[PDB]
Amino acid sequence: KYAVVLKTLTDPFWQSMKAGIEAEAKELGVTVDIFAAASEGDAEAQLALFESLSNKNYKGIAFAPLTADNLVEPVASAWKKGTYLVNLDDKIDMKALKAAGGNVEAFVTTDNVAVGAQGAGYIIEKLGAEGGEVAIIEGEAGNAAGEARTKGATDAFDKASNIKLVASQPADWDRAKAKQVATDILAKHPNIKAIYCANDTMALGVAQAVADAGKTGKVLVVGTDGIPEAQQAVKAGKMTATVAQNPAAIGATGLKLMVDAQKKGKVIPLDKKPQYVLVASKLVTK
Numbered sequence: 001k002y003a004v005v006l007k008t009l010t011d012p013f014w015q016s017m018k019a020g021i022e023a024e025a026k027e028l029g030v031t032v033d034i035f036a037a038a039s040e041g042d043a044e045a046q047l048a049l050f051e052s053l054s055n056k057n058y059k060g061i062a063f064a065p066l067t068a069d070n071l072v073e074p075v076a077s078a079w080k081k082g083t084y085l086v087n088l089d090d091k092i093d094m095k096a097l098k099a100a101g102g103n104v105e106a107f108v109t110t111d112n113v114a115v116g117a118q119g120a121g122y123i124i125e126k127l128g129a130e131g132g133e134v135a136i137i138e139g140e141a142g143n144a145a146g147e148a149r150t151k152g153a154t155d156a157f158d159k160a161s162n163i164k165l166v167a168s169q170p171a172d173w174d175r176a177k178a179k180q181v182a183t184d185i186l187a188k189h190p191n192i193k194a195i196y197c198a199n200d201t202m203a204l205g206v207a208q209a210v211a212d213a214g215k216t217g218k219v220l221v222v223g224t225d226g227i228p229e230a231q232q233a234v235k236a237g238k239m240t241a242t243v244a245q246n247p248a249a250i251g252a253t254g255l256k257l258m259v260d261a262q263k264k265g266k267v268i269p270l271d272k273k274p275q276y277v278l279v280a281s282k283l284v285t286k
Contacts, residue, residue: 131162
């Protein structure tokens with residue numbers, strides 16, 4: 001049997017990952033027990049949950065760590081016991097894991113450079129031959145996913161000859177700061193035709209700034225994550241689109257890699273790097 005430790009099970013992202021794991025488990029004909037800590041946003045509770053999956057006979061464990069290092073010790077313990085481990089979504093601190101004498105078979109996550117390229121690419125297509133001025137609302141400095149989305153969008157915009165990136169400023173994943181940053185940007189660059197946002201919380205605030213500026217329907221607003229309010233905003237025309245991740249495929253892929261890894265009969269050696277598997281995201285429109 002196999003086990004999966006998710007972050008929560010109330011967030012639709014994680015519910016969808018659970019759904020994908022179960023659908024893939026049926027296809028593969030394997031039994032998977034899927035868990036989330038009862039105490040949410042609690043790094044030690046997820047640690048204790050993982051450690052509780054030690055008396056059980058799980059051949060492999062896939063996990064989405066609440067923090068970079070909160071599962072380092074139990075993951076190292078599982079690896080030393082021969083458990084086939086797959087890191088889901090957010091990357092475990094591999095430096096800390098290796099220093100603890102452990103490793104994982106694979107890391108399955110979203111390609112966040114491609115996410116930014118996808119949101120920018122949708123904007124480029126929507127602006128047609130005329131193109132125009134565009135802006136990027138960045139995430140908080142030091143966040144790897146946000147830097148990758150900013151890079152992917154910046155590179156895509158730069159390659160498009162009719163597209164001019166006139167602003168690229170952080171709003172620190174904050175809805176109110178994004179509205180204020182976008183309002184400033186729309187005031188200094190009134191010809192802007194599109195804004196890519198590194199996440200939906202910022203995009204929703206940017207959508208308000210565009211509305212407040214009198215440019216509803218005139219400035220495209222593209223978010224990232226596909227959170228429910230962004231999907232609602234896209235349907236209502238308040239946002240143009242959002243780049244949604246595919247947690248179902250992340251989970252299904254993580255299970256497949258776990259089942260394939262156990263066929264080896266031996267876990268990944270300490271001196272090998274885990275397989276790196278990127279899952280494509282999907283544009284939410286209409």
